[PDB]
RNA sequence: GGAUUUUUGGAGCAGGGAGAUGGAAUAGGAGCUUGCUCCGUCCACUCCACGCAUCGACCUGGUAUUGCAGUACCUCCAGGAACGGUGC
């Protein structure tokens, strides 16, 4: 059991992330886990009004993340 | 240590299937990678949502923790899933 | 010690189930598995503003039932006895 | 290991409902409060108490509150919020 | 300083009054008397905290770890 | 024990409750411990949806009855 | 690969200022040092404040100790 | 071969094209429709062709009943009781039946829910102004005939008779 | 075998404001029926902030495609917005 999740080819790609609360946001991947916990380096979020607010490194739960859709073609 | 419905779910990939979200997301498209634990990866996949947003993405990945219900076809409802 | 094991021996017992959403179905526990999911036969299941409708059989989960009422003439002193 | 656990951590505060027949109350996510005395416990907080008394409010959806009593009921320990112990039975 | 575990934080804090604060917006302030390994809490004199107000006491109070969003040591 | 429960109805059209309001009725061929159910040729009511073979997960279900004899 | 658990361990390293957002609640969240950390990411914060994005108030609470089955994501700041 | 509870619990029951559960009775030549209690309203659409019913009545309640295939029949009359037993009855097949006037189509405007009708290949649809009377006496009706109903055909419908 | 993807739950609660606006046939209290006055529950319309923007389904008119396939959904233009959900 505790398979880890198939994230090995959407590594250092960009992708955008949904967070629970309706969250969004866009960053390349730089990491895996086992509990679905993903690495955003230099990530940006979406704010209610439409700008993006650039978070730097942020770590996402796999408890809230709704889905990860991959802007970059593998 | 493996289930019925995970292995039909692991047996219909690469068909034309959708997946809907407990929040009304629909990702819709070829099934390229399905683990154990309801973890759906797709290509050249398309949101039809409850919120109705439909657009066309090229790769998508909706895990098993939101996932609420999938709609598969029924090519693999005759054999060898009668029981 | 454990609670399923005197859930599992409470069946042929006229019960009700109490859910999170405010449904209620009261009848006889048929039965009972190790991960409480409760069989019944013959219920009646009332929702949150909504008609009594009578079933011939229900199966409950243990994660969705949020209370549980048992009659006043049930032995609990004696079904606690493992 | 076990039963020192429970006989010494927040378990006990059960363990002094059953042993010594004290009333508590069990303030759920319905809000609705229910006292009575504990009667059956277990690791995952599963309460089988009896005489146990259940007191909310509604709305007509002014609203108003309401109570009602049960000769003996069974609550998981999912539902349980907020468990509290008063010497409310002397 | 040094990096403390939560739990020898959470074995120490016993006898110290402190709140613990629920999701749910309500808070418990009082002396922690028991705390084990499962993050669950026991008090004594517990007073509760409703919108930035008293609301009363309950004397011993028991808050699962389900429950309980954040805890405080005052 | 005998764990009898669900396979008495196995290959028979069951209506399961979710947890939002609706209601799936469908075929049950398979189940696991998850409480996975695979309902083939499912209809959806809260109107009808033209769904087919829906596999819901156990996390949204909240009650299961039977609605009529096996095709 | 970068791990979580070892960018957590050089935060918690560094003493630096990060922000943590709660689950479905996204008027108010934390803000802290992160001193030690556990298994169940349980965050130990010093001098913590929290930040509610409605009312735009700072409530400091001081030694707070976060579970991780709240925090959904966790951002550096510089303040 | 009258319609009996053991001819219904032995006859083929399965999905049809439009994902509805559908019961194939075709081929029992039925005189009458009757004993339709034994199905307990599992059934969304009800194959009752080719057989020789000559009034649509006798069916007891069924909510789930929304689609009744009565084609190459020999119908002549409609029930008045067609609404008390079927309110959710939406889709009408009576082509090829047995309808000669006019007046057996009043009892079928108290189907609030219907909206698709066939009354194709009938004597009643070869009389004068026949889909503007059926126009104005059902007006929930949105396809008569394979055809839909627009909104200069319902204002000669609700001009003339008026 | 209660610590992130299933079973000891992060669930509960409330629908913006105003107007000498309108109704409780049989169901509010008080000034101790009836008539009148006051106050903590809806729907219809009007005004400010058609609560806002988004996409899907859908109706009218015009318009293009005549094509042999196993399907989230399928031409375009304009008007209306009865429905769904998303963030404030």
Known sequence: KA?????????????????????????????????????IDECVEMATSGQQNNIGMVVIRGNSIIMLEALERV | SIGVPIKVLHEAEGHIVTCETNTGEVYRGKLI?????????????????????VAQLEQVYIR???????????????????? | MKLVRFLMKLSHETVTIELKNGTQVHGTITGVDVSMNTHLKAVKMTLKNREPVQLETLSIRGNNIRYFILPDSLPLDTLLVD | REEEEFNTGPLSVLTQSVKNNTQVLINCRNNKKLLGRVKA??????????????????????????????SKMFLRGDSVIVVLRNPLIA | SL???????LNGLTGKPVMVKLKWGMEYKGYLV????????????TEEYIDGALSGHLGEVLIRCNNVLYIRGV | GKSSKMLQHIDYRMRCILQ???????????????????????????????????????????????????? | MVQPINLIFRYLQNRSRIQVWLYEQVNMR??????????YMNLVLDDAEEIHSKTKSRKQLGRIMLKGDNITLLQSVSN | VKLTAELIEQAAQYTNAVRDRELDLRGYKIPVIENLGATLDQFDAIDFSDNEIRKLDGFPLLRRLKTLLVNNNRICRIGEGLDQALPCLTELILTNNSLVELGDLDPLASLKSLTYLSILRNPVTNKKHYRLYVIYKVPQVRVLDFQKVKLKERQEAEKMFK
């Not at chain 4, 007509?60 to 509150?65: F, G, I, L, Y």
Request: some cysteine; proline content about 7%.
């Open chain 4, 41 to 70: 416990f277990d690791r995952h907080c599963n309460m089988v108490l009896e005489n146990v008394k259940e007191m909310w409010t509604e709305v007509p959806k002014k609203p108003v509150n309401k109570d009602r009593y049960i």
């Open chain 6, 20 to 71: 939002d309001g609706r209601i799936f009725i469908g075929t049950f061929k398979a189940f696991d411990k998850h409480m996975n159910l695979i309902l083939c040729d499912c209809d959806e009511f809260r109107e009808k949806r033209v769904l087919g073979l829906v596999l819901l997960r156990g996390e949204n279900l909240v009650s299961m009855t039977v609605e009529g004899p096996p095709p």
């Open chain 7, 30 to 39: 934390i803000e802290g040092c992160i001193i030690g950390f556990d298994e």
């Open chain 2, 33 to 53: 990678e399905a683990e154990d634990n309801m973890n759906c990866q797709m290509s050249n996949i398309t949101v039809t949502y409850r919120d109705g947003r």
């Open chain 1, 3 to 39: 398979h880890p999740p198939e994230l090995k080819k959407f590594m250092d790609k960009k992708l955008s992330l949904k967070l629970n609360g309706g969250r969004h946001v866009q960053g390349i991947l730089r990491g895996f886990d086992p509990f679905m916990n993903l690495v």
């Open chain 5, 3 to 9: 990096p403390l575990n939560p739990k020898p934080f």
């Open chain 2, 64 to 83: 098993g923790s939101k996932i609420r219900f999938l709609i598969l076809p029924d090519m693999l409802k005759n054999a060898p899933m009668l029981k």
């Open chain 5, 34 to 45: 028991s705390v084990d390994g499962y993050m669950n809490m026991q008090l004594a004199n």
